[PDB]
Design a protein around this ligand. Structure first.
Ligand SMILES: NC(=O)C1=CN([C@@H]2O[C@H](COP(=O)(O)OP(=O)(O)OC[C@H]3O[C@@H](n4cnc5c(N)ncnc54)[C@H](OP(=O)(O)O)[C@@H]3O)[C@@H](O)[C@H]2O)C=CC1
Ligand SMILES: NC(=O)C1=CN([C@@H]2O[C@H](COP(=O)(O)OP(=O)(O)OC[C@H]3O[C@@H](n4cnc5c(N)ncnc54)[C@H](OP(=O)(O)O)[C@@H]3O)[C@@H](O)[C@H]2O)C=CC1
Lengths: 257, 257
C-alpha cells in the first residue's frame, strides 16, 4: 500500500493560508482547502505536481459554529491543472481522501493548518456582541473543533495503519497565532481579536502537553505584518514584520523537520 | 451631594468572589453580587457596616450568552444584617443604585470584578462542543459584555458627575485571570479553560491601553490554588499557591492604591 499524506488548510482561499497551501503542494502533499462560501471556493478553483497529487476545496462558514459540526454534507469543488473544476458534495472533511484512494493508494490527512481568521478594527466598548461572537467563532471555537475532529481521525488512522510510523511525519496540527496574542504589541481596536489569538495560542500549548505523549505534534506560529487602521496608529508606528511566503516556509519546516 | 461607590462582583456567591465582596464591604463600598440562578442568590442572602451601605444579589446565567443582554428584567434580592431578604426585580445591573439613591445620596458603580468562572477537567478531544461553549460564555464572552456595559456606564457617570474626579478612585475594572493562562503551568484537562483565561487576560491588557487615556483603570489578577483531578497530576505535583483572602486583599490594593 502507498499511503499519501493530505493537508487540511483553513483560510486558504487567499492571504497566508494560500501561501501555506502552495508550499505544501510544492512539497508533495495533496490539499483540502477551506473557505467560508460556495462563491469563495469557486473563486480559488480558478500548479503542476506529481500525478497522484490532488486538490479540493470545501465551503464551511465558521461563523455558524457550532451548527456546522452537524451539516450532513458540505459543498466542495475538486480542481485541476489544465482541467475544469468539479462540483462535489463531501460527507465529511475526510471524504475527499476516501474518493481519491484506490486499490493501490491510500490518501489520509496528516496535517491540519488553522489559518482562517477574522479581524477587528473597533474599540471594545464600540464592538457589538455579534461581532465578538463572529470573531471568537471563526478565530477560536471553530479551530478548536477542527483540531479535535482531526485528532480523532489522526489517532484512529494511526491505530489502523501502524506502518505509517517511521515511514511518515507524525500527525501534525499547526495553529496560526499572531504577534498580538502577547507582550508589547497591545493595539487599540483589537481587544477581542488579540484575545482570540491568545486563546488559540494557549489552547495549543496545553493541547501539545496532552498530545505529545500520544504522538500528535501541535505547534503554533506567531507572525505579524502585511490593518491598519484599527489611538491605534500611535503604537503600530512606534513599534517586527512577517511575509506570507516566510510563514509558508515555517509551516513546512515544522512538518518536515 | 454624597456620592457613594458601589462594586459589582460576579462569581461572588462563594469562593474567591465571596472573599472579594467581604473585603469591599469591610472597606466601605456597597455591593451588587452576581450568581447564576435564583436559588444560588437566595442561598447567599442567608456583616455590620455603615448605615448607608447596601447589598444585593442578581441572578444571571452566563451560559445564556448572548441572550441575557436582552432580558427585560433580572431577578434580584436585597439582603441585610438583622432583617430578612427582600425579593427584587431589577431592570438593569445599575437599577439597585437608582433605588438606593435619595435626595441626599447618589449610589453609583465604580468597580466591577469579573470573578465568575467555570472549570474544565477533560482532555480537549474528550470535551464536547457545548462544554466548550459554556466555558467560553461564562469565562470570556460574558465578562467582556459585563466590562463593556460597565465602561459605558462609567464614562457617562464621569461626564454627568464631574466632581467625582479627585474625590474618588478612578472607575476600575478587575478581571480574574489564572496562573494557567500562560507560562510553565500547562495542565492536561484544562485546554479551553486556560485559553479562556488567556483570552480574558489579553483582552484586559489591550482594553487597558484603550481605557487608561479615558481614565478607566483595567487590571487583571492571576492567582492559582485551593481541581485536581483534571496525565494531569504529574505536572500539578511537579510544580505557587493562592488564598482567596490574599486575592481579596490584592483587589482592594488595586482599587484603593
Ligand atoms: N494580516 C496580518 O498582518 C497578520 C495575520 N495573522 C493571522 O494569520 C491568519 C491569515 O489571514 P490573512 O493572511 O491575514 O489574510 P486574509 O485575512 O485576507 O484571509 C482570511 C481567511 O479567513 C477565511 N475566513 C474569513 N471568514 C471566515 C468564515 N466565517 N468561515 C470560514 N473562513 C473564513 C477567509 O475565507 P474567505 O475567502 O471565504 O473569506 C480567508 O481564507 C489570520 O488568522 C490572521 O489573524 C497573524 C499575524 C499578522
Ligand atoms: N480554584 C483555583 O484554584 C483558581 C481559580 N481561579 C479563578 O478565580 C475565579 C473564582 O472561582 P473559585 O474561587 O475558584 O470558586 P468557585 O468556582 O466555587 O466559584 C464559581 C462562581 O462562578 C459562578 N458561576 C458558575 N457558573 C455560572 C454561570 N453559568 N453564570 C454565572 N455565574 C456562574 C458561580 O455562581 P453560582 O454559585 O451560581 O454557581 C460562582 O459564584 C474563577 O474564575 C476561577 O477560574 C484562578 C486561579 C486558581
Amino acid at each position: 500500500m502507498h499511503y499519501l499524506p493530505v493537508a487540511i488548510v483553513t483560510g486558504a482561499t487567499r492571504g497566508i493560508g494560500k501561501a501555506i497551501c502552495q508550499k505544501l503542494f510544492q512539497k508533495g502533499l495533496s490539499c483540502i482547502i477551506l473557505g467560508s462560501t460556495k462563491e469563495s471556493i469557486e473563486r480559488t478553483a480558478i500548479q503542476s505536481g506529481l500525478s497522484y497529487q490532488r486538490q479540493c476545496a470545501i465551503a464551511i462558514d465558521f461563523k455558524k459554529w457550532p451548527h456546522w459540526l452537524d451539516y450532513e454534507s458540505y459543498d466542495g469543488i475538486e480542481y485541476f491543472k489544465d482541467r475544469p473544476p468539479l462540483k462535489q458534495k463531501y460527507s465529511t472533511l475526510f471524504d475527499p481522501c476516501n474518493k481519491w484512494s484506490n486499490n493501490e493508494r491510500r490518501y489520509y490527512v496528516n496535517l491540519l493548518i488553522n489559518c482562517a481568521g477574522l479581524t477587528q478594527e473597533s474599540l471594545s466598548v464600540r464592538t457589538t456582541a455579534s461581532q465578538i461572537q463572529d470573531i471568537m467563532n471563526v478565530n477560536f471555537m471553530s479551530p478548536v473543533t477542527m483540531t479535535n475532529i482531526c485528532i480523532k481521525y489522526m489517532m484512529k488512522s494511526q491505530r489502523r495503519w501502524p506502518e505509517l510510523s517511521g515511514q511518515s511525519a507524525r500527525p501534525t496540527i499547526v495553529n496560526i497565532s499572531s504577534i498580538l496574542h502577547s507582550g508589547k504589541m497591545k493595539v487599540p481596536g483589537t481587544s477581542v481579536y488579540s484575545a482570540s489569538k491568545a486563546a488559540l495560542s494557549r489552547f495549543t500549548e496545553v493541547l501539545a502537553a496532552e498530545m505529545e505523549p500520544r504522538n500528535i505534534r501541535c505547534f503554533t506560529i506567531s507572525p505579524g505584518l502585511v490593518q491598519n487602521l484599527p489611538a491605534k496608529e500611535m503604537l503600530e508606528r512606534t513599534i517586527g514584520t512577517s511575509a506570507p511566503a516566510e510563514i509558508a516556509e515555517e509551516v513546512w519546516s515544522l512538518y518536515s523537520r
